[PDB]
Amino acid sequence: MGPGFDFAQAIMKKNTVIARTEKGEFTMLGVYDRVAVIPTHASVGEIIYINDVETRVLDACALRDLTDTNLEITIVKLDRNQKFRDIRHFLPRCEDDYNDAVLSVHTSKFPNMYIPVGQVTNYGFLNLGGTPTHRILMYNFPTRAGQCGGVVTTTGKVIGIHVGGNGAQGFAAMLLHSYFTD
């Protein structure tokens, strides 16, 4: 409807796949080459389904900060025959607050879903499903089951992936450029 949704759509159409693990279907953001991200609670194994194709996982790393605190981001390298468009130049370098963000989801259950979530707070610490978690972004939308892995964007930046909610607020794990240096 506007330039927020325009940027979000451009990311969804070229840089997302549907990932299925034993824990469900997730929006998965492809970042560069065969490297993607997914919430750590997806519990990625040796094999994952990507757009319903059986795919070997070449490497998977559950990120933690240097306080050894969960970040709730898993980086996955996929044995896929095709590279993602490189979107690393759209990743923020530092922890920040944002105005006017969109949360975008693409699954069997929620195809082509775009939610204007508004102001995003650098929340920091969250007890997420009982796990102390750092680098959490917060937005005031009643997000629901099925939105995990959803991509959070502003115009020109990909800032996070949706990892939880409490019925009134939603929470995303930050994406930072430094996670994807190669």
Tab-separated table of N, CA, C and O in Angstrom, residues 125-170:
chain	number	residue	atom	x	y	z
A	125	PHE	N	16.756	-7.368	27.174
A	125	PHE	CA	16.588	-8.662	27.876
A	125	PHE	C	15.108	-9.048	27.857
A	125	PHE	O	14.241	-8.193	28.151
A	126	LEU	N	14.838	-10.316	27.555
A	126	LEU	CA	13.497	-10.938	27.643
A	126	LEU	C	13.674	-12.370	28.128
A	126	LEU	O	14.536	-13.102	27.606
A	127	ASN	N	12.857	-12.758	29.098
A	127	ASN	CA	12.685	-14.185	29.462
A	127	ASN	C	11.709	-14.804	28.468
A	127	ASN	O	10.501	-14.594	28.632
A	128	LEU	N	12.217	-15.480	27.439
A	128	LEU	CA	11.445	-15.931	26.264
A	128	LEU	C	11.171	-17.432	26.393
A	128	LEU	O	12.094	-18.205	26.239
A	129	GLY	N	9.936	-17.833	26.705
A	129	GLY	CA	9.645	-19.264	26.947
A	129	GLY	C	10.529	-19.827	28.060
A	129	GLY	O	10.941	-20.988	27.958
A	130	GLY	N	10.863	-19.029	29.077
A	130	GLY	CA	11.751	-19.433	30.191
A	130	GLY	C	13.250	-19.346	29.873
A	130	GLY	O	14.063	-19.701	30.741
A	131	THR	N	13.654	-18.926	28.673
A	131	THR	CA	15.097	-18.839	28.332
A	131	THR	C	15.529	-17.371	28.369
A	131	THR	O	14.978	-16.565	27.618
A	132	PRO	N	16.508	-16.948	29.205
A	132	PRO	CA	17.012	-15.573	29.165
A	132	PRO	C	17.525	-15.311	27.738
A	132	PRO	O	18.238	-16.153	27.219
A	133	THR	N	17.068	-14.240	27.119
A	133	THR	CA	17.398	-13.908	25.705
A	133	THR	C	17.829	-12.443	25.634
A	133	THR	O	17.206	-11.610	26.290
A	134	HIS	N	18.845	-12.126	24.840
A	134	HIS	CA	19.279	-10.728	24.624
A	134	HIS	C	18.952	-10.256	23.201
A	134	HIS	O	18.563	-11.064	22.352
A	135	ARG	N	19.161	-8.969	22.964
A	135	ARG	CA	18.968	-8.269	21.657
A	135	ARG	C	17.544	-8.433	21.121
A	135	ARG	O	17.358	-8.569	19.897
A	136	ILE	N	16.546	-8.315	21.987
A	136	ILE	CA	15.121	-8.430	21.586
A	136	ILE	C	14.574	-7.062	21.199
A	136	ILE	O	14.882	-6.038	21.851
A	137	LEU	N	13.883	-7.047	20.075
A	137	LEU	CA	13.098	-5.902	19.579
A	137	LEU	C	11.652	-6.143	19.996
A	137	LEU	O	11.191	-7.304	19.924
A	138	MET	N	10.932	-5.088	20.366
A	138	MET	CA	9.515	-5.244	20.791
A	138	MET	C	8.613	-4.322	19.974
A	138	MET	O	9.024	-3.156	19.718
A	139	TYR	N	7.451	-4.825	19.585
A	139	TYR	CA	6.415	-4.016	18.897
A	139	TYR	C	5.054	-4.361	19.479
A	139	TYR	O	4.847	-5.474	19.919
A	140	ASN	N	4.139	-3.388	19.444
A	140	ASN	CA	2.830	-3.475	20.140
A	140	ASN	C	1.812	-4.009	19.150
A	140	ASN	O	0.887	-3.252	18.850
A	141	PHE	N	1.965	-5.248	18.679
A	141	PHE	CA	0.927	-5.949	17.878
A	141	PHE	C	0.662	-7.309	18.498
A	141	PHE	O	1.619	-8.007	18.810
A	142	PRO	N	-0.628	-7.707	18.643
A	142	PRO	CA	-1.008	-9.034	19.126
A	142	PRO	C	-0.726	-10.121	18.088
A	142	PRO	O	-1.645	-10.661	17.471
A	143	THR	N	0.560	-10.429	17.940
A	143	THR	CA	1.076	-11.470	17.015
A	143	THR	C	0.702	-12.859	17.574
A	143	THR	O	0.554	-12.985	18.819
A	144	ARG	N	0.581	-13.869	16.700
A	144	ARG	CA	-0.013	-15.195	17.031
A	144	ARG	C	0.851	-16.319	16.469
A	144	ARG	O	1.692	-16.054	15.565
A	145	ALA	N	0.642	-17.526	17.004
A	145	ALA	CA	1.189	-18.801	16.495
A	145	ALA	C	1.114	-18.786	14.961
A	145	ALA	O	0.053	-18.381	14.419
A	146	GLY	N	2.207	-19.167	14.291
A	146	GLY	CA	2.325	-19.147	12.817
A	146	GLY	C	3.189	-18.004	12.288
A	146	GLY	O	3.595	-18.087	11.107
A	147	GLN	N	3.489	-16.983	13.106
A	147	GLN	CA	4.271	-15.806	12.650
A	147	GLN	C	5.768	-15.968	12.954
A	147	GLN	O	6.554	-15.102	12.451
A	148	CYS	N	6.187	-17.053	13.625
A	148	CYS	CA	7.620	-17.205	14.001
A	148	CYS	C	8.457	-17.369	12.739
A	148	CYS	O	8.048	-18.132	11.821
A	149	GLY	N	9.556	-16.603	12.690
A	149	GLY	CA	10.488	-16.587	11.550
A	149	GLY	C	10.121	-15.423	10.643
A	149	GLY	O	10.909	-15.087	9.715
A	150	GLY	N	8.975	-14.795	10.926
A	150	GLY	CA	8.489	-13.687	10.099
A	150	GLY	C	9.557	-12.630	10.021
A	150	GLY	O	10.296	-12.453	10.985
A	151	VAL	N	9.661	-11.934	8.915
A	151	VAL	CA	10.744	-10.941	8.736
A	151	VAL	C	10.246	-9.564	9.144
A	151	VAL	O	9.152	-9.107	8.653
A	152	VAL	N	11.038	-8.886	9.953
A	152	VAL	CA	10.777	-7.477	10.361
A	152	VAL	C	11.650	-6.543	9.533
A	152	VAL	O	12.899	-6.638	9.588
A	153	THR	N	11.003	-5.638	8.781
A	153	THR	CA	11.705	-4.648	7.950
A	153	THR	C	11.230	-3.222	8.240
A	153	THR	O	10.104	-3.007	8.692
A	154	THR	N	12.098	-2.277	7.968
A	154	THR	CA	11.715	-0.881	7.685
A	154	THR	C	12.072	-0.601	6.232
A	154	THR	O	12.774	-1.448	5.631
A	155	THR	N	11.696	0.565	5.702
A	155	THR	CA	12.165	0.957	4.352
A	155	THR	C	13.703	0.919	4.373
A	155	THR	O	14.329	1.651	5.131
A	156	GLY	N	14.269	0.040	3.570
A	156	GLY	CA	15.701	-0.071	3.306
A	156	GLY	C	16.422	-0.901	4.337
A	156	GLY	O	17.595	-1.048	4.143
A	157	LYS	N	15.786	-1.404	5.414
A	157	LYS	CA	16.527	-2.268	6.377
A	157	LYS	C	15.744	-3.516	6.769
A	157	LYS	O	14.520	-3.449	6.975
A	158	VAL	N	16.468	-4.614	6.856
A	158	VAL	CA	15.954	-5.904	7.407
A	158	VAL	C	16.500	-5.985	8.827
A	158	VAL	O	17.737	-6.113	8.960
A	159	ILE	N	15.639	-5.851	9.856
A	159	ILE	CA	16.130	-5.574	11.235
A	159	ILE	C	15.959	-6.778	12.168
A	159	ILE	O	16.599	-6.759	13.214
A	160	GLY	N	15.163	-7.797	11.833
A	160	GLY	CA	14.953	-8.902	12.784
A	160	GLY	C	14.071	-10.016	12.245
A	160	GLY	O	13.498	-9.860	11.131
A	161	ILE	N	13.921	-11.062	13.057
A	161	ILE	CA	13.022	-12.211	12.773
A	161	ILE	C	12.163	-12.431	14.025
A	161	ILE	O	12.678	-12.411	15.182
A	162	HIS	N	10.861	-12.557	13.807
A	162	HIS	CA	9.834	-12.720	14.874
A	162	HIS	C	10.089	-14.036	15.629
A	162	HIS	O	10.234	-15.097	14.975
A	163	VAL	N	10.150	-13.987	16.969
A	163	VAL	CA	10.491	-15.191	17.786
A	163	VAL	C	9.461	-15.449	18.897
A	163	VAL	O	9.538	-16.537	19.489
A	164	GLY	N	8.530	-14.540	19.147
A	164	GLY	CA	7.524	-14.799	20.194
A	164	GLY	C	6.559	-13.672	20.410
A	164	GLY	O	6.679	-12.599	19.792
A	165	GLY	N	5.619	-13.895	21.325
A	165	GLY	CA	4.667	-12.842	21.714
A	165	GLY	C	4.033	-13.171	23.047
A	165	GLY	O	4.278	-14.300	23.550
A	166	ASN	N	3.304	-12.228	23.632
A	166	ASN	CA	2.611	-12.450	24.940
A	166	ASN	C	1.112	-12.135	24.821
A	166	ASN	O	0.488	-11.946	25.876
A	167	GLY	N	0.565	-12.076	23.603
A	167	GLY	CA	-0.843	-11.737	23.332
A	167	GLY	C	-1.056	-10.270	22.997
A	167	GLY	O	-2.000	-10.002	22.232
A	168	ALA	N	-0.280	-9.345	23.577
A	168	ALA	CA	-0.382	-7.875	23.368
A	168	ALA	C	0.826	-7.333	22.580
A	168	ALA	O	0.684	-6.356	21.805
A	169	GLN	N	1.994	-7.898	22.839
A	169	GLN	CA	3.262	-7.488	22.182
A	169	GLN	C	3.856	-8.661	21.406
A	169	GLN	O	3.524	-9.828	21.687
A	170	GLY	N	4.656	-8.324	20.392
A	170	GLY	CA	5.483	-9.301	19.668
A	170	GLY	C	6.955	-8.987	19.878
A	170	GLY	O	7.291	-7.820	20.164
